[PDB]
């Protein structure tokens, strides 16, 4: 912006990237500071009459660790389903 | 309470190991005091070595004697290497006093303390 056009031609002749259009010298793109202030919404809370904390008590639903052994068999289980093999890309994979 | 051992089955191999480590620390001191370019006579160094061995005189458990031997052999690894510095080997010496007394009287004038 506001540079002589022959040196801009030497810029885009030095590298074919169209250096003028996206040049990373941002002039006035950032909006005006001290904006209109926001009225912050509040989500699923202080809706009256059913905000019993016993319902959404994630602190009092921690459970102690359940135990198995201490100090005709369709079995030999794995810890998980065997994980499905992935799939190639779409937008220009190789190949 | 049969604890699994470290190296030995009684204290005799522990005595053998600690005297072998003392042999090694005897022959390794003048190499260091020639190598780190210190300012200390050799006999002063050897005598503080045997003082640091005599500091732990009351130790009787075999695992613990083995673990002291492992500590001393690790530091002799660090002094056959030059991985340590001049500061650490002078820090084994106690030369910047610290002249802190042992009498009751001087600990009374400089007090709030037994």
């Amino acid at each position: 912006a506001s540079a002589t056009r022959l040196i801009q031609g030497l810029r885009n002749w030095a590298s074919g990237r169209d250096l003028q259009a996206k040049l990373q010298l941002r002039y006035q793109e950032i909006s005006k500071r001290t904006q209109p202030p926001p009225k912050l919404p509040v989500g699923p809370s202080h809706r009256l009459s059913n905000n019993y904390y016993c319902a959404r008590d994630g602190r009092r639903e921690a459970m102690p660790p359940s135990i198995v052994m201490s100090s005709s068999e369709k079995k030999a289980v794995s810890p998980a389903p065997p994980i499905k093999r992935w799939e190639l890309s779409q937008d220009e994979p190789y190949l | 309470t049969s604890v699994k051992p470290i190296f030995s089955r009684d204290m005799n191999e522990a005595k053998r190991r600690v005297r072998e480590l003392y042999r090694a620390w005897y022959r390794e001191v003048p190499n260091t005091v020639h190598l780190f370019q210190l300012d200390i006579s050799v006999k002063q160094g050897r005598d503080k070595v045997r003082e640091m061995f005599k500091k732990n005189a009351h130790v009787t458990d075999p695992r613990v004697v083995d673990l002291l031997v492992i500590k001393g052999k690790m530091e002799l690894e660090e002094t056959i290497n030059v991985w340590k510095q001049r500061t650490h080997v002078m820090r084994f010496f106690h030369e910047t006093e610290a002249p802190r007394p042992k009498d009751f009287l001087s600990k009374f004038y400089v007090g709030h303390d037994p």
Binding site: G43, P44, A55, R56, G58, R59, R60, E61, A62, M63, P64, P65, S66, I67, V68, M69, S70, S71, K75, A76, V77, S78, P79, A80, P82, I83 | V3, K4, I6, R63, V64, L67, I70, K71, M74, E75, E77, E78, W83, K84, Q85, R86, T87, H88, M90, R91, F92, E95, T96, A98
Partner: protein, 208 residues
Amino acid sequence: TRPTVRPRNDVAHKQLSAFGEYVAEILPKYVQQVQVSCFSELEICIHPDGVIPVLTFLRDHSNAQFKSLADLTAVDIPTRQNRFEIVYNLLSLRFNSRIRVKTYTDELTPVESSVSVYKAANWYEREIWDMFGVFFANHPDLRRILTDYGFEGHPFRKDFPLSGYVELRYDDEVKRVVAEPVELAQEFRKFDLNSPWEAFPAYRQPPE
């Protein structure tokens, strides 16, 4: 319920339940506790004589691959007859799974140095040697990592205080750095932050 509360899973819960009972069935010599939390990560609690058998079984056997390793920090706990907890954290590659192997130990009895079965275990084992002092028999290399050389005392124990005993400064009397006993310029005011009135009712141990 639906908002603000993390919805627990059941598929991985039942699967790790069955898998823990599977391991408990197939190695009865070295199983003491199998346990599952509410968020379903497996814990297997182990006497320290079958550490190498359990690890050689868990890296292999093809019912559970478990290639990848994470640290074993023996979290420093008094009041127990055997103090420390070696905590393996195994992370598989074919299964997307997380198991933990808590074997126990104490201050002098060595454990069998898992470096020979996991090459990753070497610097973690040297770290736990330098910071706690659990000596590792049948091990190639035990140096001290992440401390000073001339320092000792194994500072992560509960017995070692928050600030150290030694303190380094410079002096021109011997033109070098020397060590001194510690002198703090401010007390570090500890805060009593332990509320009464039974913060969680489910976790009451049976009283004496």
